[PDB]
Amino acid sequence: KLWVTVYYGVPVWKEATTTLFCASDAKAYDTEVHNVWATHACVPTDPNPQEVVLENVTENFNMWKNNMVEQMHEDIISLWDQSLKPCVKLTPLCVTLNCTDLRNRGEIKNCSFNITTSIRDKVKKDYALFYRLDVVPIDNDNTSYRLINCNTSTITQACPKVSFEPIPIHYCTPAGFAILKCKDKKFNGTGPCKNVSTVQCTHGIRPVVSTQLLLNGSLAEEEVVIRSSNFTDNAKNIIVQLKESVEINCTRPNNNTRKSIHIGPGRAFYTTGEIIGDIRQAHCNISRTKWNNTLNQIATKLKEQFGNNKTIVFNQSSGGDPEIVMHSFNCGGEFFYCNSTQLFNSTWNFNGTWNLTQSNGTEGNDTITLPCRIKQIINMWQEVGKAMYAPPIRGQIRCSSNITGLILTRDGGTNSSGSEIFRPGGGDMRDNWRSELYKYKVVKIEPLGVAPTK
Amino acid sequence: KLWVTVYYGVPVWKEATTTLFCASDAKAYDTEVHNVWATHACVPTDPNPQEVVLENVTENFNMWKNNMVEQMHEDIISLWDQSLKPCVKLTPLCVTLNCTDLRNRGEIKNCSFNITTSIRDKVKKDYALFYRLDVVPIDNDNTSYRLINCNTSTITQACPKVSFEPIPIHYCTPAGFAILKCKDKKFNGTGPCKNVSTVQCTHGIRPVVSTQLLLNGSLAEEEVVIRSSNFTDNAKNIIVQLKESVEINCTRPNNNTRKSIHIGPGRAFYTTGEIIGDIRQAHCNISRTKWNNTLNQIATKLKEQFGNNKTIVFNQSSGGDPEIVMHSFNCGGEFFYCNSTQLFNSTWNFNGTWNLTQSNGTEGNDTITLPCRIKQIINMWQEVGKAMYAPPIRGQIRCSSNITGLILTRDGGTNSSGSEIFRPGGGDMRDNWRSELYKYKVVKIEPLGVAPTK
Amino acid sequence: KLWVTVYYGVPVWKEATTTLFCASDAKAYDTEVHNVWATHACVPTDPNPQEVVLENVTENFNMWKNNMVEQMHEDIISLWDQSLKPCVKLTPLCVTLNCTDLRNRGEIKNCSFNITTSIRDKVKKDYALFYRLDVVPIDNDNTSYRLINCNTSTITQACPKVSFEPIPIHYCTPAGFAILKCKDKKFNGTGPCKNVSTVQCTHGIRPVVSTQLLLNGSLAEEEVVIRSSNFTDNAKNIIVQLKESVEINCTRPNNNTRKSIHIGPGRAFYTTGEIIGDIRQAHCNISRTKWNNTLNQIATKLKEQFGNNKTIVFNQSSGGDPEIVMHSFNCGGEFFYCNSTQLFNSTWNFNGTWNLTQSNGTEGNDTITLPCRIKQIINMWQEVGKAMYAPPIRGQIRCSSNITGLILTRDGGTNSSGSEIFRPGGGDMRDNWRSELYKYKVVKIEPLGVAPTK
Amino acid sequence: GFLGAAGSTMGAASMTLTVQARQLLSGIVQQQNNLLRAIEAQQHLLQLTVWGIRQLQARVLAVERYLRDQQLLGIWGCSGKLICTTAVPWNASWSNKSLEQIWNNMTWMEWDREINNYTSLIHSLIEEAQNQQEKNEQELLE
Amino acid sequence: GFLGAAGSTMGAASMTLTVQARQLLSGIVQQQNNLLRAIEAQQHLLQLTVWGIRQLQARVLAVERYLRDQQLLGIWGCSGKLICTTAVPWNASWSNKSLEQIWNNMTWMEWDREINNYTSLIHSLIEEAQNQQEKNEQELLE
Amino acid sequence: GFLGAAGSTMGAASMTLTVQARQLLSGIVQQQNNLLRAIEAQQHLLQLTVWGIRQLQARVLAVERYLRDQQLLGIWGCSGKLICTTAVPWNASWSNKSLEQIWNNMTWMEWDREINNYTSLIHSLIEEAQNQQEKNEQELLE
Ligand SMILES: CC(=O)N[C@@H]1[C@@H](O)[C@H](O)[C@@H](CO)O[C@H]1O
Ligand SMILES: CC(=O)N[C@@H]1[C@@H](O)[C@H](O)[C@@H](CO)O[C@H]1O
Ligand SMILES: CC(=O)N[C@@H]1[C@@H](O)[C@H](O)[C@@H](CO)O[C@H]1O
Ligand SMILES: CC(=O)N[C@@H]1[C@@H](O)[C@H](O)[C@@H](CO)O[C@H]1O
Ligand SMILES: CC(=O)N[C@@H]1[C@@H](O)[C@H](O)[C@@H](CO)O[C@H]1O
Ligand SMILES: CC(=O)N[C@@H]1[C@@H](O)[C@H](O)[C@@H](CO)O[C@H]1O
Ligand SMILES: CC(=O)N[C@@H]1[C@@H](O)[C@H](O)[C@@H](CO)O[C@H]1O
Ligand SMILES: CC(=O)N[C@@H]1[C@@H](O)[C@H](O)[C@@H](CO)O[C@H]1O
Ligand SMILES: CC(=O)N[C@@H]1[C@@H](O)[C@H](O)[C@@H](CO)O[C@H]1O
C-alpha cells in the first residue's frame, strides 16, 4: 500500500529569484566613516554564518541568468541616490568660468569663476583648479569655457565627506531562501556543480567600480579561466579569470589642494586649490615577469579553437566612450583611470616562451610604466542626468589595486578563421559584477514533501 | 445537558462593508493597450471562480446602501488621477487663441494660437481645430476667445495614447468576505432574496461613463423594472430596467485630423487638424418599433399609482448642466453626447397601442434620426479643477452603444395627483453605478459558532 | 531529577523601552472641537482599563531615564506639525508694518500694514493691533518696525480655529507591554517600588505647556517632595512636588477684537482689532496664606544639608530667555505669561513661622497681585523656524490655573557651604513632563520560563 | 457548498463546514493568476492606485483576521481541527429552548442571535475554564 | 492578577498564568473603542501623525512578537496549552540549588537569572531533542 | 546539515529534517546583530534606501510564506510536528514505481517531480479527507 504521506522540514532546493539583504562586518561598523561610499544602518554580518558544504549533491548554475546582479546594481543606485540627497548643490557653481592654462597637454589650468554667497546680491569671485575634462572651449562664440556637465544637466556636489573607498559588503538571504554556491574553480557560469555549499549569507566581496578589469576581487585559483556569455559571438565580452594577481601603482605623486569655501546657507564647495611645488603628472609602475607568466597562461588558456595551437592576438579598442575604452576605478574618492595601452601590444601565438621574460635578467625598460589619469565627475551605470563633483584628497593620491580578472571582446571586423583578435571591451558593466557570481545561486527551500509510504 | 460547544468553519453570512479588488480577464491583459482608460497591473480574473448558488436561503439587500459604489468611484478616481500623472501638461497651450469660424451654428472654427517650444525664447505659431465649447468669446474686452477651462484652472493633456474605451472589469472580495448576489429579476434594491448565490468575484461589468442612460450594461430580463430610492420623492431619480436593448448609432461621418506637435522636452499636443472634404455634422439613426414596444412596456410598468391606469407623462428636462440635461458617454476617446429630445415627446397614457408602430407598415420618418454631439474636455464626478484634452481619433467616429436602463426624475413643480410627470434626471451619477448592484452584497463569513450540545 | 520544564503565560516583568499610544476619553471625543490643540482620530480610553495593584512585589524606576518623555515630546511635535499643515500661511502678512503707539510701557500700538488679496495686483491696506513683541524698531535705518519672527524665518497662521486648550490624554501600552506604576508618594525618580500596580493604559494627564511651574497636573500628596536629577549639581534643576495647590488668576480684564479678513483664496487672518473702552493691562491676584504654608513646607522640605536647619534662600533668575526666566503657559489659545517675581523675595531660613501669615489677621497687601503678560507667537521645544500667530480670543481672557509642582536651579555662582541659593530654572522643558513620570515604567511581559522540575 | 448547504440546520450545517472552509479560502489561486506584473500584453503604465494598494490592503486585513482566528485556536488549545469542545456549560442565560430544535430551527443563527450576548457571555469563560481549570478526559478504570 | 499573584513563587506563579495571560492580551477591546474614525463629535482634522501611525506600528511589532511565540510553539510541538514539557534535562550548568527552593525563593526570576544563559543553554536543545530525537510517552504493559 | 545530508535518499533525508529546519530558520540571529541603528562607530547618514527597506521587505515576504505554512498545518490538523500522516492514498496517477526505490533513488525529488502534478493532485484531497472525512485511529478491542 503506497499510502501517501506528508513530511515537513524536508531537504528541498528550488530555483530562487528573490531579494538579498546587505551585510557589513564588525570591521565595517568600526570604519567610523559616516559613510565611506558604501556603508548604511543595514544589518551587519553575523559572527559565524553557516556555509554547509553539500557533497554528493548536484546544482546547475547560470551566473549570467542569476538575478543577483540586478538587485545588486539597483540597490547600489538607490544607496548612491540617497547618499547624494544630503550633499550640497552646485547649481550656481555652474556659472561660466575663465580658465588660464598655467601648466603648459597637461590639463592643469587654474580656473577662476563666480561663486555666489549666502545673500542674494552679495557675490564674490573665486578660482579653483579645473581640468580640461570638466569644461570645454566654446568654438561657437569662443568667449570662455563651459562645464560639459553643466550645459547638459544640473550640477551638485559629490558629498566630499563621503569618500569613495571600497568596503567589505555581505549579502544575506531571507528566511527560507539559501544561496547555493559552487565550490568549483573551473566552474563556469551556466553549469552544474557538485561542490554545492549552501550559504545563508554570501561571502564578503569588494565592489570597486572598474571598467574592463577587476580591483581587489575574488581570485580564481588553480587555473586561468576564460569564460564568455557567447564565445562565437564576437560582441560577447570575454570574461577571464587570472590565476594570480599583479601589483598596480596608480599613484599620483603631486599633492592636492582643498579650498573649503562656504557657498550657500551651510553649503561649501571644495575647490581644487593650487598645488605646492612643481606640478608634474601622475605615473604608474607595474611588474613585468608575473604579468608575462599570466599572459602565457591566458594565451595557453586562450587556445580554444586556435588553428594549430597558435591563434592568440590582442589589439587596442578601436575607440569609443572613455569608460569603455580604458580602465577606470575609484580610489580615495579620486576616480583613477590608469590606462591600458601596454597590454594590447603583445602576442603569445607561436611561443608563449618567446615573449616570456626572465626575472634575473630583467630588461632595462621591463617595469611597465605608463601614464595614469584621474577625474572629478562621473555618471554611474551610464545614466545621463544630474552630475557630481569629486573634492580634492589634499595629498599625494596613492592607489594600490590588484588584478584578478579581465574582459575582452572578440573582434568581429576581421577574419572568422584566420586569426582570433581580442580587444578590450568595457561595454557591459555587469560582467564585472557577475564574474564572482558564477557559483552563488539563490536557492529556495521547501519543507513540504509527498511520498507514497506503507 | 446543554453543554456549550464551539464549532469552526461554520456556514455564516454577515453584513460585510469592506474593500473589493480589481479583476480583469485574460482577454483584458490581451488587449495590449498600455492602458485603454481602464486596465492596470491588477489581478486578473481567475479561470473559474465559484458562484455557489444558495437556495432555500434568504438574504436582504440594499443597493443604495451598498458601499460598493463608494469604493468603486474612489478607485476610479484614483486610477484616473494616476493615469493623468504621466500625461504631458498643456499649461502653455493655455495661451489665448484666435479662432476663425470657417464652417458657418456649426462650432467648427479653425483656431490658431501660440504653442511654445523646447527653448525658453524659441516659440512658433500653430493652428488647430477647436469647437465653440473649448473657448468662449470675451464680451468684456472682446479681443479674442479664451478657453473656459483655461481661465478657471490648469490645463493638461488627457493621455491621448490612453483611449477611453470600455473594458471588462471584475471585482473580487478578500479572503473571508463573500459577495452574496441575488439571482432575482424583479429583485429591487432594499429587498430580501432567496436566490442567494455566494460569489467570490462579482460578475464582469462594463463601466462606461454615461448620463441619464446606460451603455453596454447588465440587462434585466423577463420584465421591465422601474425602481427609485423614493418614488414619492419627485426629486428621487427613477431608475428603470428595460427588458430589451436598442441599437444606437452615435457615429460621426466626418473624419478627424491629428497634428502630433512636440511642445515640451518630450511632450506633444495632438491638435485637431483640418478635416478632408466637406465637413458635415455628426448624425444618429435609431430604431422605432422595438423602442415603441419598450415604451409601452414602461408605460405599462409606470402605472404605479396611475389614476385609472392612465397616468404616464414625459417631459424634457427644464434645463441645467450639460452633463445632466443630456446623455453623455465616452466612445473611442471622443466624449459622445447623443441627444435625447426624441423620448420626451411621447405619451402612452390611454392606449399603449395607440402610440405603437407596426414594423411592416413603418412610417416614413419612423427611424429615429437626431443630431449627435461630441466633446474634448471633461470633469469626472463633477470635480472642478485641472482639466484634460481629448485628442483626435483621426477617423470617422463610429460608436455602437446599446440600451438596458434609464433614469427619470418625477416632476415636483406640477400637480401631485393630477398627472404623473417624469423628466430626464442625470443629477446623480451613482444611480448609473448602482443599477447593476442591487443583487450583490458584500457578505462577511465567520466560522465561530456556539451551540448548546449534549 | 531536575528535568528542565518549559512554561507559558508566566508572570514576567522586564525593562520595556517601546512606543506608547494615545488615548482620549469619551468626554474627549465629546469635546466636539475639530481639534482643541490636542485631540486626534486616535483610540479613546477604554471604559474600564485594568490597573492591577501588585503588592509584595518590587520594581525599580528611573523617571529621568524613562523613555516615555521622548516619544511623548516627539509625538507632540508630530501632532503640532500636522496640525499646522492645514492652517493658512502668513508670508505676505510678513510685509513691513507701521505701528502707532496709541496706548502710551504699554505695548499696545495699533499697527497698520499692507495685507494682500486674492488677485496678484489688487492689494488693499489694513491695520490690526500688535504688541511690542511681534515687531521691533529698526535702529539701522529706523524707517518702521519689523516682525522679529519675520526677518528670521517664515510666518504662518496658528490655526485660530484650533484653540490651545488642555485636554485629557491617555497613553496605552502595546499588547504584551505593561506600564508598571509605583503607588508611592515619596517615591523618587530612580528608586525601587513595592506598590507596583501594573497599568495597561497610564492614568489620564493634562499636558499644559508651562515653564518653571505646573498647571493642572498630578498632585503629590501626604508630603512636599523636592527631587532633582543631581542635588549636588547646582545646574541640575530642582524638581519640587508641592503638597497642596493654589488658585491662580491669570485673567486679563480687557477684551479682544478679531478681524477675520480674507487674505488668500480661502485664507483669512484674524488681526487683533481695536479694544472697546479704556484699554488697561492684564492683572493677577493670588492667595497668600496657603502659599505661606506651602513655602514653610518646602523650606522645611528644603533642609537637605542645611547648616543647623537654616539654609534656605531664593533669588530671581539672573536673566536669560523669556521662556526660561518666567512662567509661560497656554490658556484659551493666548499664551499667558504670568510673572513670578513674588516668590524669589522670601526666606524661611531661621523661622518658617516668622514668615508665616495668619488668615484671620491677613495684612492689607497680603493678596499676591502682580502683573500678567500674554503673547501671540511661540516656538515649541525651543525650535528656531517657521513661526505661528495666535488669533484673538475676542473676550476677557480668564485663565484659572492651579499649582502642583516647581522647578528650581541651585546657584553655582555663590558659596558652596555658606548658604544654599535656589533660583528659578526653566531651562529643561522635559523636567515638566517627567515630574509625573516617576512611577510609570514601561514593563515588558515574557511568558517563556525554564525551570528544573521533577 | 461555499456557504449554502445550510438553510436552517445545525447538523447539516456542521457537516458542510469543511466544504465551506475550503471554498471560502480559495482566493489565493485568484491572487496567483495575477499576470499583473507591469503590462497586459504590449504596453502599460504604473497605474498602481490607492485602489489596488488597497486591494492588497483589504487582503492583508482579512488575512490578519484569519491570523487572529489561529491565535484564538492557540489560546484555547483548540487548533487541532474544527471538532473541539468547551469545558463551559450553556448558561440558563439563553431562554428555555429545546437544543435539537435550536439546532434544526435556529440555522445556527437564531440560537446564536438570542444567545448572542449569551454566546459571547459563554465565550470568555473558556480560556480560564478549559485552560485555567484545565482537566484531562474521563475518569474510568480498566 | 495581570502580573501580580507572584512575588516569590514558582507554583503560585505557575497557577496564575492564565489570569495573567488573559489580563495582558486584553488590549484588543481598547482598540475596539477607537471611536476614532475622523472626528470626536462635531469637527476635526486629519491629525494622523507619526505618533499614531507609530501607535499602530508598536501594536504591529508586539503582535509580531506574539506571532513568533506561536511559531516557536509550533517548532517544538508545544502549542497545545501552557502545560508542555521538555525532553531536555537541566544541565549541571546552573549552580547546585534545591529545586523546590529554586521555586519558592527564585520568583522564577532568580533561577532564570543564574540559569539565564543556562536557561537559554537548555533552550536550543529542545527542537532536536524533543522533535529531532522525538520519543512518545512511557513504555509499559497492560 | 542545513540542506545536505540527502543526495538521493528518502529515509536519511527524512531523518535530517530537524537539522535542516533549525539551520535554515537561523537568520533571526543575524537580524539580531544588526548593530545598525544609525551609525557604525563615529558618524553616518540615513542611507536607508530601497535596498534595505526591501531587505526587510523580502524578510517579510519569506516569513509570510512560513506563516502560510503554519496556516496549512492548522487546516489539516498537521501542526503537531514534522511527523504527520494523510488519510489519502497515492493515486495510481504516479507511474508504476517501487516505493522503497522511489525513496532511495528519487532523492524525494524524482518521486515528487513525476508525481508532481500527482503530488499536488494528492494534496487537495487531504483537507476534506483527513478533516472532512475525519476518522480517529484504529478499531481494536481490549
Ligand atoms: C574543483 C573543486 O571542486 N575544487 C574545490 C576547491 O575549490 C575547494 O577549495 C576545496 C575545499 O576542500 O574543495 C575542492 O573540491
Ligand atoms: C620600479 C618601481 O618603482 N617599483 C615599485 C615597487 O618597488 C613598489 O613596491 C610598488 C608598490 O606598489 O610600486 C612599484 O612601482
Ligand atoms: C425570479 C428568479 O429567481 N429568477 C431566476 C433567474 O434569474 C435565473 O436565471 C434562474 C437560473 O436557474 O433562476 C431563476 O430562479
Ligand atoms: C436607417 C439606417 O440608417 N439604419 C442603420 C442600420 O441599417 C444599421 O445596421 C445600424 C447600425 O447601428 O445603424 C442604423 O442607422
Ligand atoms: C506610601 C504609599 O505606598 N502610599 C500608597 C498611597 O499612595 C495609595 O493611595 C494607597 C492606596 O491604598 O496605598 C498606599 O500604600
Ligand atoms: C482678592 C481677589 O480678587 N480675590 C479673587 C477671588 O475672590 C476669586 O475667587 C479668585 C478666582 O480665581 O480670584 C481672586 O483674585
Ligand atoms: C422552533 C421552530 O422553528 N419550530 C418549528 C415547528 O414549529 C414546526 O412545526 C416544525 C416543522 O418541521 O419545524 C420547526 O422548526
Ligand atoms: C534560597 C532562599 O531564599 N531561602 C530562604 C531561606 O533562607 C528562608 O529561611 C526561608 C524562610 O521561608 O525562605 C527561603 O526562601
Ligand atoms: C530507480 C533507480 O535509481 N535504481 C537504481 C538501480 O538501477 C541501481 O542498480 C541501484 C544500485 O544501488 O541504485 C538504484 O537507485
Author numbering:
A (entry chain N), B (entry chain A), C (entry chain Y): 33 to 136, 151 to 500
D (entry chain B), E (entry chain Z), F (entry chain O): 521 to 662
From the paper:
The envelope glycoprotein (Env) on the surface of HIV-1 is an essential viral entry machine that mediates binding to host cell receptors and subsequent membrane fusion. Env is translated as a precursor gp160 protein, which trimerizes and is cleaved into gp120 and gp41 subunits that are primarily responsible for receptor binding and fusion, respectively. The gp120 and gp41 subunits remain as non-covalently associated heterodimers with gp41 embedded in the viral membrane via its transmembrane domain (TMD) and the C-terminal cytoplasmic domain (CTD) in the viral lumen. As the sole target for neutralizing antibodies, Env is also of singular importance for vaccine design efforts.
A total of 32,802 sub-volumes were used to reconstruct a C3-symmetric sub-tomogram-averaged structure of hVLP-Env with local resolution ranging between 5.7–12 Å and a global resolution of 9.1 Å. Classification of the sub-volumes did not yield any other distinct conformational class, indicating that the hVLP-Env were in a predominantly closed, pre-fusion state. The Env ectodomain connects to the membrane via a thin tripod stalk. In contrast, in hVLP-Env, Gln-653 forms the distal tip of the HR2 helix, making the helix length 10 amino acids shorter. The remaining residues in the C-terminal portion of HR2 helix bend and form a thin stalk connecting the ectodomain to the membrane. In the presence of membrane, we observe that the thin stalks, corresponding to Env residues 654–664, form a tripod that elevates the ectodomain ∼10 Å above the membrane. As a result, the bulk of the membrane-proximal external region (MPER) (residues 660–683), which is a desirable vaccine target of some of the most broadly neutralizing antibodies (bnAbs) of HIV-1 isolated to date (Gray et al., 2009; Rantalainen et al., 2020), is primarily embedded within the membrane in our structure. However, in our structure, only partial density for the HR1-C helix can be observed corresponding to gp41 residues 570–577 and 582–595. In contrast to most available structures where density near to glycosylation sites often covers only the core n-acetylglucosamine (GlcNAc) sugars, in our unliganded hVLP-Env structure, extended density for glycan moieties is observed across the protein. Thus, the tripod stalk of Env is flexible in its membrane-embedded state, allowing differential sampling of MPER and other membrane-proximal epitopes.
